[PDB]
Amino acid sequence: RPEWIWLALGTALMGLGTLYFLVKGMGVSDPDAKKFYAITTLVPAIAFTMYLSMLLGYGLTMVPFGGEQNPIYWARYADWLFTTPLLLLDLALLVDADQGTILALVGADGIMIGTGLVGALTKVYSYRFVWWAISTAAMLYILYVLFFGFTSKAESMRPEVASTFKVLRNVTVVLWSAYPVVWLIGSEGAGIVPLNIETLLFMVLDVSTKVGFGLILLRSRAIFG
Amino acid sequence: RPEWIWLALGTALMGLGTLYFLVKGMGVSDPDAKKFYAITTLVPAIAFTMYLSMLLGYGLTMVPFGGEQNPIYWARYADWLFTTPLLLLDLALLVDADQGTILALVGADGIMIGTGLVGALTKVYSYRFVWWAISTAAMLYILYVLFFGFTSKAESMRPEVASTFKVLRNVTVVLWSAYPVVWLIGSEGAGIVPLNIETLLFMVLDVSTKVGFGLILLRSRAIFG
Amino acid sequence: RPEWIWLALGTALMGLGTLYFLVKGMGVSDPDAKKFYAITTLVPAIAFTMYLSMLLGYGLTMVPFGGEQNPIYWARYADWLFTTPLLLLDLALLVDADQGTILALVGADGIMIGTGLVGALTKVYSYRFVWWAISTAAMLYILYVLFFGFTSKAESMRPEVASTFKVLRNVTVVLWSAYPVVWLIGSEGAGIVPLNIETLLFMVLDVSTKVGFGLILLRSRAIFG
Ligand SMILES: CC(C)CCCCCCC[C@@H](C)CCC[C@@H](C)CCO[C@H](CO)COCC[C@@H](C)CCC[C@H](C)CCC[C@@H](C)CCCC(C)C
Ligand SMILES: CC(C)CCCCCCC[C@@H](C)CCC[C@@H](C)CCO[C@H](CO)COCC[C@@H](C)CCC[C@H](C)CCC[C@@H](C)CCCC(C)C
Ligand SMILES: *C/C=C(C)/C=C/C=C(C)/C=C/C1=C(C)CCCC1(C)C
Ligand SMILES: *C/C=C(C)/C=C/C=C(C)/C=C/C1=C(C)CCCC1(C)C
């Protein structure tokens, strides 16, 4: 299958991302730095396994909608289900967010992937978009809290915290919101962009939001207590 | 389908419930009130999505048992899986429960929905009831802790706490135990009550245990620190 | 089916395990002893439900690999998914492990069962072993942290803690690593050992790692604060 190379290239990059983070994580014995290193290595590990599941073709399935037999990488939702809230925890711990606010976001994130998955496998075409919309909605809630609520409390901590957060926020804020767009125009939605392009688009995005995101966070001197 | 209206009416009520709670939650910046507001809005959000999934027919499936092809809304279990422990957490935080007790209840709740679901999709008629029984059993465990162990510690806190808890306990204690009953006589079990009635019965129950429940809790002056 | 008796025997042992733990747990009102009792009872309850689901034949499924139709107790992965991380929590709470480290382990455990399941239901034979290997790899990570990281901080606490831990570690360290071996040689992998034997092998293992493990822990005077 044409996108095979993109799934390979992502399996690889996620692999190396995990291993790098795993080694870079050796000899870190601060409770706070641990937490971070822990979460930030899980994302690409989980990501790695799902990229491989897609590469080997275990993450793939045939959903009928549109009078056609459309291909749907369901693995992506299995992956995101776990990676995406972890990624949020990273941000939340950093700014020192309320037990409350975290539960809020994870809840929202859950629903977001939750509905997105439902969407992806729905057999009535127009219906899929109702799911998209609901998910897209949950996203706007995350992006809100991240942008408004978080930047407030982010700005009332150490110089290194606020800075690192701000970059990490920005990256997420931008790249995260690219996913629904891709979804919509892609084979899950309109079928405007072809699968091989969609996969590549997603593949670049994932690598960035995870390894890229991770590289920034774990490199910073801001993960410490 | 006859119950379509009940699923609509519940989608709606859960929708509004979520939105009411979402707005009512704006401008609440106490760490404790947040926690509550967060949990109590997830419930109806999750509930909203699952009611919609049933309405659109994504939460529905055909399970054969009894030499028939019986309609099972599986989405209910996907819903309850998450909503029900959250609801417990609400009660648990209110009384200031031990880290232990909470894990106890969530585990029990898990098993209750867990087996419930297993029961619901079991193809051997008599077998379903074994599952019912096991689930019904875990329920009696929660209702216990709630009634005995919780009311103890509930009673050794502020006046507003004990009061609010007591109502909330009562509401849960009564309406929660109605679910198995309905399950049993309904199309999951005996098939005495018809699906459309079952759905309405369930719909009324859900709206109460969630929005109803929530309305009470979020209105009280007892969610604060 | 030949192994029916083994699943029965396990259902039974897990049942009694649960009930014993449930009774023995009455009248324990220390926050730390609660936590432990809570987790250690969940394992066998969860275990009980999945051994029944396997006995009743709800946990079973036909996976095609090797040009044959192989039988795969998928329930095992449903069980382990939850039992195995709880088992680790028990160990981690005991030694007083970092929020970080726990999250680390649970993560690894998730991936372990995560991939194991993927493996079990994979339709390409050689493929199954790639999953095994990845899973087996996560295991080595858990066994490491348990053996190296944990024994360090374990040895810097009370005499009773270090001792009990050391036993519990050892039991886990040995018995846990038997599972992959069994998997490989069994009907999931090579199909060297027969299912009825595999089941018996697993059956003994589960009972030991759960009830046995639990009997040791809950009997000890080290679960207290
Ligand atoms: C707050 C609100 C409630 C928000 C909820 C959003 C609900 C919207 C539901 C969409 C619904 C009106 C149906 C859209 C399909 C539309 C193309 C026409 C219906 O069927 C077509 C035949 O006419 C199928 O064409 C197949 C041929 C293809 C070439 C497809 C047409 C090309 C279009 C560019 C893609 C259109 C489909 C979706 C992107 C529509 C909604 C997108 C929007 C939410 C960004
Ligand atoms: C501590 C214990 C281990 C736990 C106990 C769990 C085991 C219970 C399993 C019962 C099992 C032997 C099956 C019972 C069915 C029995 C009435 C036979 C009639 O079955 C009918 C035809 O064969 C099925 O159609 C159905 C047609 C119906 C419309 C007929 C009406 C009569 C009844 C209402 C049939 C339904 C049976 C259930 C109500 C079972 C009782 C539940 C009870 C535990 C509250
Ligand atoms: C590592 C993967 C990450 C960080 C993925 C993030 C994914 C999203 C934010 C996906 C969002 C979606 C919507 C908002 C609309 C519906 C389609 C989805 C699931 C692609
Ligand atoms: C918002 C939904 C709530 C609070 C649902 C609560 C549901 C239950 C307590 C269901 C219980 C069941 C049993 C105890 C017996 C078996 C059947 C079930 C799953 C309906």
Ligand SMILES: *C/C=C(C)/C=C/C=C(C)/C=C/C1=C(C)CCCC1(C)C
């Ligand atoms: C109560 C059950 C317990 C403690 C189970 C532990 C199970 C494992 C450690 C299973 C491990 C596996 C691998 C490491 C390789 C692939 C096959 C598995 C899933 C059997």
